[PDB]
Amino acid sequence: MGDILTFTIPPSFADIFLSKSANLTCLVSNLATYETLNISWASQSGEPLETKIKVMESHPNGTFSAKGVASVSVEDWNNRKEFVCTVTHRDLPSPQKKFISK
């Protein structure tokens, strides 16, 4: 508590097989201020990724965290690419960035 935690979750081989699209998932928890929260996904090159997020506020149902789902090409995951998620809670002076790779 009182310290913002950011973790990234990779899509499973099975999951990618079902949808035939790889998805980037970010989990942000332990928010010192459970007011509102946003999730941001971008390519390593600093290029914003198509991300779909429902509710600009963190979800207190089942979990107390927010998740951002970005749709990437299976090719990227297959080519060992890496993506960057940045969490902007405004609570911290420096947004936390996370690297994700299969």
A tleap script that builds the chain and sets N, CA, C and O, in Angstrom:
source leaprc.protein.ff14SB
mol = sequence {
  NMET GLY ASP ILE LEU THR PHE THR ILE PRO
  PRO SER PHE ALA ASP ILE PHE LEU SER LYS
  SER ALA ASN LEU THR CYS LEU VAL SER ASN
  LEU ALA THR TYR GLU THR LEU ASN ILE SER
  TRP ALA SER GLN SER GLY GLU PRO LEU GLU
  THR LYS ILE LYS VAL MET GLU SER HIE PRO
  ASN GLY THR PHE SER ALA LYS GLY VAL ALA
  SER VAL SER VAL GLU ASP TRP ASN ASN ARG
  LYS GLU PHE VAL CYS THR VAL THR HIE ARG
  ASP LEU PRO SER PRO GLN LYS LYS PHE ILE
  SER CLYS
}
set mol.1.N position { 0.850 -1.210 0.000 }
set mol.1.CA position { 0.000 0.000 0.000 }
set mol.1.C position { 0.875 1.246 0.000 }
set mol.1.O position { 2.000 1.222 0.500 }
set mol.2.N position { 0.358 2.332 -0.560 }
set mol.2.CA position { 1.086 3.591 -0.571 }
set mol.2.C position { 2.245 3.592 -1.549 }
set mol.2.O position { 3.147 4.425 -1.454 }
set mol.3.N position { 2.218 2.661 -2.486 }
set mol.3.CA position { 3.270 2.539 -3.485 }
set mol.3.C position { 2.706 1.874 -4.722 }
set mol.3.O position { 2.212 0.748 -4.659 }
set mol.4.N position { 2.779 2.564 -5.842 }
set mol.4.CA position { 2.153 2.098 -7.075 }
set mol.4.C position { 2.944 0.969 -7.721 }
set mol.4.O position { 4.123 1.121 -8.041 }
set mol.5.N position { 2.279 -0.160 -7.906 }
set mol.5.CA position { 2.881 -1.317 -8.524 }
set mol.5.C position { 2.410 -1.486 -9.948 }
set mol.5.O position { 1.216 -1.433 -10.242 }
set mol.6.N position { 3.368 -1.688 -10.821 }
set mol.6.CA position { 3.086 -1.943 -12.223 }
set mol.6.C position { 3.728 -3.253 -12.669 }
set mol.6.O position { 4.924 -3.471 -12.475 }
set mol.7.N position { 2.918 -4.114 -13.265 }
set mol.7.CA position { 3.390 -5.384 -13.785 }
set mol.7.C position { 2.752 -5.647 -15.137 }
set mol.7.O position { 1.622 -5.227 -15.387 }
set mol.8.N position { 3.465 -6.335 -16.003 }
set mol.8.CA position { 2.954 -6.627 -17.328 }
set mol.8.C position { 2.691 -8.114 -17.486 }
set mol.8.O position { 3.455 -8.944 -16.993 }
set mol.9.N position { 1.613 -8.446 -18.174 }
set mol.9.CA position { 1.247 -9.832 -18.382 }
set mol.9.C position { 1.278 -10.170 -19.862 }
set mol.9.O position { 0.593 -9.537 -20.665 }
set mol.10.N position { 2.076 -11.173 -20.221 }
set mol.10.CA position { 2.165 -11.665 -21.590 }
set mol.10.C position { 1.001 -12.582 -21.938 }
set mol.10.O position { 0.543 -13.346 -21.088 }
set mol.11.N position { 0.513 -12.517 -23.179 }
set mol.11.CA position { -0.529 -13.420 -23.647 }
set mol.11.C position { 0.032 -14.822 -23.833 }
set mol.11.O position { 1.165 -14.994 -24.282 }
set mol.12.N position { -0.763 -15.810 -23.489 }
set mol.12.CA position { -0.313 -17.189 -23.514 }
set mol.12.C position { -0.358 -17.735 -24.931 }
set mol.12.O position { -1.112 -17.234 -25.766 }
set mol.13.N position { 0.441 -18.755 -25.210 }
set mol.13.CA position { 0.468 -19.357 -26.537 }
set mol.13.C position { -0.940 -19.768 -26.960 }
set mol.13.O position { -1.344 -19.555 -28.103 }
set mol.14.N position { -1.678 -20.359 -26.026 }
set mol.14.CA position { -3.055 -20.761 -26.272 }
set mol.14.C position { -3.930 -19.557 -26.602 }
set mol.14.O position { -4.719 -19.595 -27.546 }
set mol.15.N position { -3.787 -18.491 -25.820 }
set mol.15.CA position { -4.617 -17.298 -25.988 }
set mol.15.C position { -4.393 -16.673 -27.357 }
set mol.15.O position { -5.343 -16.291 -28.040 }
set mol.16.N position { -3.130 -16.574 -27.748 }
set mol.16.CA position { -2.770 -16.004 -29.037 }
set mol.16.C position { -3.284 -16.883 -30.172 }
set mol.16.O position { -3.582 -16.393 -31.262 }
set mol.17.N position { -3.385 -18.176 -29.909 }
set mol.17.CA position { -3.847 -19.124 -30.911 }
set mol.17.C position { -5.342 -18.946 -31.160 }
set mol.17.O position { -5.810 -19.024 -32.296 }
set mol.18.N position { -6.081 -18.708 -30.082 }
set mol.18.CA position { -7.537 -18.593 -30.149 }
set mol.18.C position { -7.955 -17.351 -30.932 }
set mol.18.O position { -8.805 -17.421 -31.820 }
set mol.19.N position { -7.351 -16.224 -30.594 }
set mol.19.CA position { -7.731 -14.951 -31.186 }
set mol.19.C position { -6.931 -14.672 -32.457 }
set mol.19.O position { -7.357 -13.906 -33.321 }
set mol.20.N position { -5.762 -15.310 -32.554 }
set mol.20.CA position { -4.823 -15.096 -33.656 }
set mol.20.C position { -4.298 -13.667 -33.655 }
set mol.20.O position { -3.788 -13.170 -34.659 }
set mol.21.N position { -4.436 -13.023 -32.508 }
set mol.21.CA position { -3.892 -11.701 -32.285 }
set mol.21.C position { -3.272 -11.651 -30.901 }
set mol.21.O position { -3.871 -12.113 -29.930 }
set mol.22.N position { -2.079 -11.096 -30.809 }
set mol.22.CA position { -1.412 -10.975 -29.530 }
set mol.22.C position { -1.876 -9.709 -28.832 }
set mol.22.O position { -2.072 -8.676 -29.473 }
set mol.23.N position { -2.051 -9.787 -27.530 }
set mol.23.CA position { -2.567 -8.666 -26.771 }
set mol.23.C position { -1.643 -8.357 -25.615 }
set mol.23.O position { -1.156 -9.259 -24.933 }
set mol.24.N position { -1.407 -7.084 -25.401 }
set mol.24.CA position { -0.566 -6.648 -24.311 }
set mol.24.C position { -1.426 -6.286 -23.117 }
set mol.24.O position { -2.353 -5.483 -23.228 }
set mol.25.N position { -1.118 -6.878 -21.980 }
set mol.25.CA position { -1.876 -6.645 -20.768 }
set mol.25.C position { -0.987 -6.069 -19.677 }
set mol.25.O position { 0.108 -6.570 -19.423 }
set mol.26.N position { -1.468 -5.018 -19.040 }
set mol.26.CA position { -0.746 -4.388 -17.955 }
set mol.26.C position { -1.612 -4.367 -16.707 }
set mol.26.O position { -2.807 -4.078 -16.776 }
set mol.27.N position { -1.011 -4.674 -15.570 }
set mol.27.CA position { -1.719 -4.676 -14.302 }
set mol.27.C position { -1.102 -3.629 -13.381 }
set mol.27.O position { 0.097 -3.667 -13.102 }
set mol.28.N position { -1.923 -2.699 -12.913 }
set mol.28.CA position { -1.452 -1.652 -12.016 }
set mol.28.C position { -2.243 -1.682 -10.720 }
set mol.28.O position { -3.463 -1.514 -10.724 }
set mol.29.N position { -1.549 -1.895 -9.616 }
set mol.29.CA position { -2.198 -2.096 -8.332 }
set mol.29.C position { -1.471 -1.322 -7.235 }
set mol.29.O position { -0.464 -0.662 -7.488 }
set mol.30.N position { -1.997 -1.413 -6.014 }
set mol.30.CA position { -1.400 -0.777 -4.837 }
set mol.30.C position { -1.335 0.740 -4.986 }
set mol.30.O position { -0.440 1.386 -4.441 }
set mol.31.N position { -2.283 1.300 -5.722 }
set mol.31.CA position { -2.342 2.738 -5.923 }
set mol.31.C position { -2.549 3.440 -4.585 }
set mol.31.O position { -3.484 3.123 -3.850 }
set mol.32.N position { -1.675 4.393 -4.275 }
set mol.32.CA position { -1.760 5.136 -3.023 }
set mol.32.C position { -3.028 5.973 -2.997 }
set mol.32.O position { -3.567 6.283 -1.935 }
set mol.33.N position { -3.490 6.331 -4.181 }
set mol.33.CA position { -4.700 7.108 -4.340 }
set mol.33.C position { -5.646 6.419 -5.320 }
set mol.33.O position { -5.526 6.600 -6.532 }
set mol.34.N position { -6.582 5.634 -4.800 }
set mol.34.CA position { -7.532 4.916 -5.646 }
set mol.34.C position { -8.632 5.845 -6.157 }
set mol.34.O position { -9.807 5.672 -5.833 }
set mol.35.N position { -8.234 6.825 -6.954 }
set mol.35.CA position { -9.175 7.751 -7.562 }
set mol.35.C position { -9.453 7.341 -9.006 }
set mol.35.O position { -10.465 6.705 -9.298 }
set mol.36.N position { -8.545 7.711 -9.900 }
set mol.36.CA position { -8.652 7.366 -11.312 }
set mol.36.C position { -7.317 6.829 -11.812 }
set mol.36.O position { -6.286 7.053 -11.176 }
set mol.37.N position { -7.320 6.129 -12.934 }
set mol.37.CA position { -6.090 5.565 -13.466 }
set mol.37.C position { -6.200 5.335 -14.962 }
set mol.37.O position { -7.274 5.033 -15.484 }
set mol.38.N position { -5.076 5.481 -15.640 }
set mol.38.CA position { -5.012 5.289 -17.076 }
set mol.38.C position { -3.905 4.311 -17.412 }
set mol.38.O position { -2.929 4.187 -16.672 }
set mol.39.N position { -4.057 3.618 -18.529 }
set mol.39.CA position { -3.045 2.679 -18.983 }
set mol.39.C position { -2.566 3.105 -20.367 }
set mol.39.O position { -3.379 3.476 -21.213 }
set mol.40.N position { -1.265 3.057 -20.605 }
set mol.40.CA position { -0.725 3.451 -21.899 }
set mol.40.C position { 0.223 2.390 -22.447 }
set mol.40.O position { 1.130 1.935 -21.750 }
set mol.41.N position { 0.008 2.002 -23.697 }
set mol.41.CA position { 0.890 1.068 -24.380 }
set mol.41.C position { 1.538 1.731 -25.586 }
set mol.41.O position { 0.904 2.516 -26.291 }
set mol.42.N position { 2.799 1.409 -25.814 }
set mol.42.CA position { 3.544 1.959 -26.922 }
set mol.42.C position { 4.610 0.972 -27.360 }
set mol.42.O position { 5.040 0.121 -26.582 }
set mol.43.N position { 5.028 1.091 -28.598 }
set mol.43.CA position { 6.113 0.287 -29.104 }
set mol.43.C position { 7.431 0.811 -28.552 }
set mol.43.O position { 7.507 1.967 -28.135 }
set mol.44.N position { 8.468 -0.018 -28.543 }
set mol.44.CA position { 9.763 0.378 -27.977 }
set mol.44.C position { 10.269 1.680 -28.604 }
set mol.44.O position { 10.965 2.464 -27.959 }
set mol.45.N position { 9.909 1.894 -29.862 }
set mol.45.CA position { 10.335 3.073 -30.602 }
set mol.45.C position { 9.599 4.339 -30.137 }
set mol.45.O position { 9.861 5.432 -30.640 }
set mol.46.N position { 8.687 4.187 -29.183 }
set mol.46.CA position { 7.952 5.328 -28.663 }
set mol.46.C position { 6.703 5.615 -29.468 }
set mol.46.O position { 6.174 6.727 -29.443 }
set mol.47.N position { 6.234 4.606 -30.184 }
set mol.47.CA position { 5.060 4.745 -31.028 }
set mol.47.C position { 3.836 4.174 -30.318 }
set mol.47.O position { 3.831 2.999 -29.952 }
set mol.48.N position { 2.792 4.995 -30.118 }
set mol.48.CA position { 1.587 4.586 -29.385 }
set mol.48.C position { 0.903 3.378 -30.018 }
set mol.48.O position { 0.781 3.292 -31.240 }
set mol.49.N position { 0.463 2.455 -29.181 }
set mol.49.CA position { -0.179 1.239 -29.646 }
set mol.49.C position { -1.680 1.312 -29.458 }
set mol.49.O position { -2.172 1.917 -28.505 }
set mol.50.N position { -2.406 0.687 -30.380 }
set mol.50.CA position { -3.851 0.602 -30.278 }
set mol.50.C position { -4.245 -0.134 -29.011 }
set mol.50.O position { -4.118 -1.354 -28.914 }
set mol.51.N position { -4.724 0.630 -28.049 }
set mol.51.CA position { -5.081 0.105 -26.748 }
set mol.51.C position { -6.553 0.378 -26.472 }
set mol.51.O position { -7.042 1.476 -26.739 }
set mol.52.N position { -7.256 -0.607 -25.941 }
set mol.52.CA position { -8.653 -0.430 -25.594 }
set mol.52.C position { -8.862 -0.650 -24.109 }
set mol.52.O position { -8.538 -1.705 -23.563 }
set mol.53.N position { -9.408 0.365 -23.473 }
set mol.53.CA position { -9.603 0.372 -22.030 }
set mol.53.C position { -11.007 0.849 -21.698 }
set mol.53.O position { -11.432 1.906 -22.164 }
set mol.54.N position { -11.725 0.082 -20.901 }
set mol.54.CA position { -13.051 0.488 -20.482 }
set mol.54.C position { -12.983 1.138 -19.106 }
set mol.54.O position { -12.512 0.541 -18.138 }
set mol.55.N position { -13.467 2.378 -19.042 }
set mol.55.CA position { -13.489 3.177 -17.817 }
set mol.55.C position { -12.121 3.803 -17.546 }
set mol.55.O position { -11.112 3.105 -17.453 }
set mol.56.N position { -12.107 5.128 -17.423 }
set mol.56.CA position { -10.876 5.883 -17.159 }
set mol.56.C position { -10.525 5.846 -15.672 }
set mol.56.O position { -9.649 6.573 -15.203 }
set mol.57.N position { -11.222 4.988 -14.954 }
set mol.57.CA position { -11.056 4.845 -13.524 }
set mol.57.C position { -10.693 3.397 -13.220 }
set mol.57.O position { -11.035 2.495 -13.985 }
set mol.58.N position { -10.007 3.175 -12.111 }
set mol.58.CA position { -9.539 1.846 -11.766 }
set mol.58.C position { -10.702 1.013 -11.255 }
set mol.58.O position { -11.609 1.536 -10.608 }
set mol.59.N position { -10.678 -0.281 -11.543 }
set mol.59.CA position { -11.829 -1.127 -11.269 }
set mol.59.C position { -11.696 -1.740 -9.887 }
set mol.59.O position { -10.670 -2.343 -9.573 }
set mol.60.N position { -12.730 -1.592 -9.050 }
set mol.60.CA position { -12.766 -2.142 -7.709 }
set mol.60.C position { -13.648 -3.389 -7.597 }
set mol.60.O position { -14.115 -3.731 -6.510 }
set mol.61.N position { -13.868 -4.058 -8.719 }
set mol.61.CA position { -14.705 -5.252 -8.745 }
set mol.61.C position { -13.861 -6.476 -9.066 }
set mol.61.O position { -13.296 -6.582 -10.155 }
set mol.62.N position { -13.777 -7.398 -8.116 }
set mol.62.CA position { -12.932 -8.570 -8.281 }
set mol.62.C position { -11.475 -8.253 -8.004 }
set mol.62.O position { -10.823 -8.905 -7.189 }
set mol.63.N position { -10.979 -7.246 -8.694 }
set mol.63.CA position { -9.635 -6.745 -8.498 }
set mol.63.C position { -9.734 -5.258 -8.164 }
set mol.63.O position { -10.803 -4.665 -8.309 }
set mol.64.N position { -8.641 -4.652 -7.724 }
set mol.64.CA position { -8.626 -3.227 -7.404 }
set mol.64.C position { -7.680 -2.490 -8.343 }
set mol.64.O position { -7.164 -1.422 -8.017 }
set mol.65.N position { -7.465 -3.078 -9.509 }
set mol.65.CA position { -6.467 -2.592 -10.444 }
set mol.65.C position { -7.093 -2.184 -11.777 }
set mol.65.O position { -8.272 -2.435 -12.027 }
set mol.66.N position { -6.286 -1.555 -12.621 }
set mol.66.CA position { -6.678 -1.257 -13.989 }
set mol.66.C position { -5.870 -2.114 -14.944 }
set mol.66.O position { -4.741 -2.497 -14.638 }
set mol.67.N position { -6.442 -2.415 -16.099 }
set mol.67.CA position { -5.720 -3.136 -17.128 }
set mol.67.C position { -5.883 -2.441 -18.464 }
set mol.67.O position { -6.962 -1.950 -18.797 }
set mol.68.N position { -4.810 -2.406 -19.218 }
set mol.68.CA position { -4.869 -1.881 -20.556 }
set mol.68.C position { -4.531 -2.952 -21.557 }
set mol.68.O position { -3.481 -3.587 -21.459 }
set mol.69.N position { -5.410 -3.164 -22.523 }
set mol.69.CA position { -5.201 -4.201 -23.520 }
set mol.69.C position { -4.869 -3.581 -24.869 }
set mol.69.O position { -5.654 -2.808 -25.417 }
set mol.70.N position { -3.706 -3.924 -25.397 }
set mol.70.CA position { -3.280 -3.430 -26.692 }
set mol.70.C position { -3.186 -4.579 -27.677 }
set mol.70.O position { -2.735 -5.670 -27.329 }
set mol.71.N position { -3.611 -4.335 -28.905 }
set mol.71.CA position { -3.649 -5.379 -29.915 }
set mol.71.C position { -2.434 -5.280 -30.828 }
set mol.71.O position { -2.269 -4.304 -31.560 }
set mol.72.N position { -1.592 -6.298 -30.775 }
set mol.72.CA position { -0.362 -6.319 -31.544 }
set mol.72.C position { -0.361 -7.506 -32.495 }
set mol.72.O position { -1.189 -8.409 -32.373 }
set mol.73.N position { 0.563 -7.501 -33.435 }
set mol.73.CA position { 0.644 -8.568 -34.407 }
set mol.73.C position { 1.393 -9.746 -33.809 }
set mol.73.O position { 2.413 -9.577 -33.142 }
set mol.74.N position { 0.873 -10.944 -34.057 }
set mol.74.CA position { 1.504 -12.178 -33.594 }
set mol.74.C position { 2.931 -12.260 -34.122 }
set mol.74.O position { 3.807 -12.867 -33.507 }
set mol.75.N position { 3.139 -11.638 -35.272 }
set mol.75.CA position { 4.445 -11.543 -35.900 }
set mol.75.C position { 5.449 -10.891 -34.954 }
set mol.75.O position { 6.594 -11.333 -34.851 }
set mol.76.N position { 5.014 -9.840 -34.268 }
set mol.76.CA position { 5.874 -9.104 -33.350 }
set mol.76.C position { 6.311 -10.010 -32.212 }
set mol.76.O position { 7.491 -10.074 -31.866 }
set mol.77.N position { 5.345 -10.707 -31.639 }
set mol.77.CA position { 5.611 -11.653 -30.569 }
set mol.77.C position { 6.490 -12.794 -31.077 }
set mol.77.O position { 7.384 -13.268 -30.375 }
set mol.78.N position { 6.220 -13.224 -32.304 }
set mol.78.CA position { 6.968 -14.302 -32.938 }
set mol.78.C position { 8.395 -13.879 -33.275 }
set mol.78.O position { 9.300 -14.712 -33.310 }
set mol.79.N position { 8.593 -12.591 -33.521 }
set mol.79.CA position { 9.908 -12.080 -33.893 }
set mol.79.C position { 10.665 -11.571 -32.673 }
set mol.79.O position { 11.686 -10.896 -32.801 }
set mol.80.N position { 10.152 -11.902 -31.486 }
set mol.80.CA position { 10.814 -11.564 -30.228 }
set mol.80.C position { 10.877 -10.053 -30.023 }
set mol.80.O position { 11.863 -9.534 -29.499 }
set mol.81.N position { 9.830 -9.355 -30.435 }
set mol.81.CA position { 9.766 -7.912 -30.247 }
set mol.81.C position { 9.449 -7.578 -28.801 }
set mol.81.O position { 8.996 -8.431 -28.038 }
set mol.82.N position { 9.690 -6.334 -28.435 }
set mol.82.CA position { 9.445 -5.883 -27.077 }
set mol.82.C position { 8.642 -4.591 -27.105 }
set mol.82.O position { 8.888 -3.715 -27.934 }
set mol.83.N position { 7.689 -4.481 -26.202 }
set mol.83.CA position { 6.827 -3.318 -26.149 }
set mol.83.C position { 6.935 -2.647 -24.790 }
set mol.83.O position { 7.399 -3.255 -23.825 }
set mol.84.N position { 6.506 -1.398 -24.717 }
set mol.84.CA position { 6.639 -0.614 -23.502 }
set mol.84.C position { 5.288 -0.108 -23.029 }
set mol.84.O position { 4.550 0.523 -23.785 }
set mol.85.N position { 4.974 -0.387 -21.780 }
set mol.85.CA position { 3.781 0.152 -21.165 }
set mol.85.C position { 4.177 1.239 -20.186 }
set mol.85.O position { 5.136 1.077 -19.431 }
set mol.86.N position { 3.454 2.337 -20.193 }
set mol.86.CA position { 3.723 3.416 -19.262 }
set mol.86.C position { 2.463 3.733 -18.476 }
set mol.86.O position { 1.396 3.926 -19.057 }
set mol.87.N position { 2.583 3.787 -17.163 }
set mol.87.CA position { 1.430 4.053 -16.329 }
set mol.87.C position { 1.433 5.496 -15.854 }
set mol.87.O position { 2.415 5.972 -15.284 }
set mol.88.N position { 0.327 6.184 -16.093 }
set mol.88.CA position { 0.202 7.580 -15.727 }
set mol.88.C position { -0.908 7.770 -14.703 }
set mol.88.O position { -2.078 7.927 -15.054 }
set mol.89.N position { -0.523 7.753 -13.436 }
set mol.89.CA position { -1.476 7.874 -12.341 }
set mol.89.C position { -1.515 9.301 -11.799 }
set mol.89.O position { -2.352 9.633 -10.959 }
set mol.90.N position { -0.592 10.146 -12.292 }
set mol.90.CA position { -0.371 11.546 -11.835 }
set mol.90.C position { 0.121 11.620 -10.396 }
set mol.90.O position { 0.556 12.676 -9.938 }
set mol.91.N position { 0.053 10.509 -9.690 }
set mol.91.CA position { 0.391 10.490 -8.281 }
set mol.91.C position { 1.901 10.531 -8.099 }
set mol.91.O position { 2.412 11.116 -7.143 }
set mol.92.N position { 2.601 9.904 -9.028 }
set mol.92.CA position { 4.051 9.870 -9.009 }
set mol.92.C position { 4.624 10.919 -9.956 }
set mol.92.O position { 3.975 11.303 -10.929 }
set mol.93.N position { 5.848 11.386 -9.670 }
set mol.93.CA position { 6.516 12.419 -10.466 }
set mol.93.C position { 7.070 11.879 -11.779 }
set mol.93.O position { 7.264 12.627 -12.737 }
set mol.94.N position { 7.321 10.581 -11.812 }
set mol.94.CA position { 7.865 9.938 -12.994 }
set mol.94.C position { 7.063 8.681 -13.317 }
set mol.94.O position { 7.068 7.727 -12.540 }
set mol.95.N position { 6.367 8.673 -14.471 }
set mol.95.CA position { 5.578 7.519 -14.918 }
set mol.95.C position { 6.426 6.257 -15.023 }
set mol.95.O position { 7.579 6.310 -15.450 }
set mol.96.N position { 5.853 5.129 -14.634 }
set mol.96.CA position { 6.579 3.872 -14.662 }
set mol.96.C position { 6.401 3.185 -16.008 }
set mol.96.O position { 5.278 2.981 -16.470 }
set mol.97.N position { 7.518 2.830 -16.632 }
set mol.97.CA position { 7.496 2.124 -17.904 }
set mol.97.C position { 7.924 0.678 -17.714 }
set mol.97.O position { 8.837 0.383 -16.943 }
set mol.98.N position { 7.257 -0.213 -18.423 }
set mol.98.CA position { 7.531 -1.635 -18.335 }
set mol.98.C position { 7.773 -2.229 -19.714 }
set mol.98.O position { 7.096 -1.880 -20.682 }
set mol.99.N position { 8.742 -3.126 -19.792 }
set mol.99.CA position { 9.075 -3.800 -21.035 }
set mol.99.C position { 8.485 -5.203 -21.032 }
set mol.99.O position { 8.555 -5.903 -20.022 }
set mol.100.N position { 7.907 -5.615 -22.149 }
set mol.100.CA position { 7.292 -6.930 -22.229 }
set mol.100.C position { 7.751 -7.672 -23.486 }
set mol.100.O position { 7.859 -7.086 -24.562 }
set mol.101.N position { 8.016 -8.961 -23.331 }
set mol.101.CA position { 8.495 -9.795 -24.421 }
set mol.101.C position { 8.117 -11.245 -24.157 }
set mol.101.O position { 8.015 -11.668 -23.006 }
set mol.102.N position { 7.910 -11.999 -25.225 }
set mol.102.CA position { 7.539 -13.403 -25.114 }
set mol.102.C position { 8.770 -14.258 -24.831 }
set mol.102.O position { 8.658 -15.477 -24.704 }
savepdb mol mol.pdb
quit
